[PDB]
């Protein structure tokens, strides 16, 4: 497949964050991380998994799971720790659902499903 590389979840740089994540055409779940982050290492098996599910199945035209490296790229966003997760719904990108990470796929489903406007579940 042309797009079958490791990264179902759209790794968005700070360059694209305002276009991709801050897009209201779809609900975008963003994860601010660092590659050296042990917390991110616990966020990755959910992110690329759920992200796969979303960006591979019926949601790949809908909610996009995305993530930006908050320490490689200088984000104009707000960090409420070192990493942060923020759901920018397609309708309430002005009041994202700020999170630090539940470390689970379950919560992610529930996340864009309750927090998302599309209710992606």
Curated annotation (Swiss-Prot):
The record marks 38-39 as: Contributes to redox potential value. It is found in: Endoplasmic reticulum lumen. Residues 6-117 form the Thioredoxin domain. It comes from the Eukaryota. Disulfide bonds join 37-40. The active site is at residues 37, 40. The record marks 103 as: Lowers pKa of C-terminal Cys of second active site. Belongs to the protein disulfide isomerase family. Participates in the folding of proteins containing disulfide bonds, may be involved in glycosylation, prolyl hydroxylation and triglyceride transfer. This is Protein disulfide-isomerase. The chain holds residues 354 to 469 of 505 of the full protein.
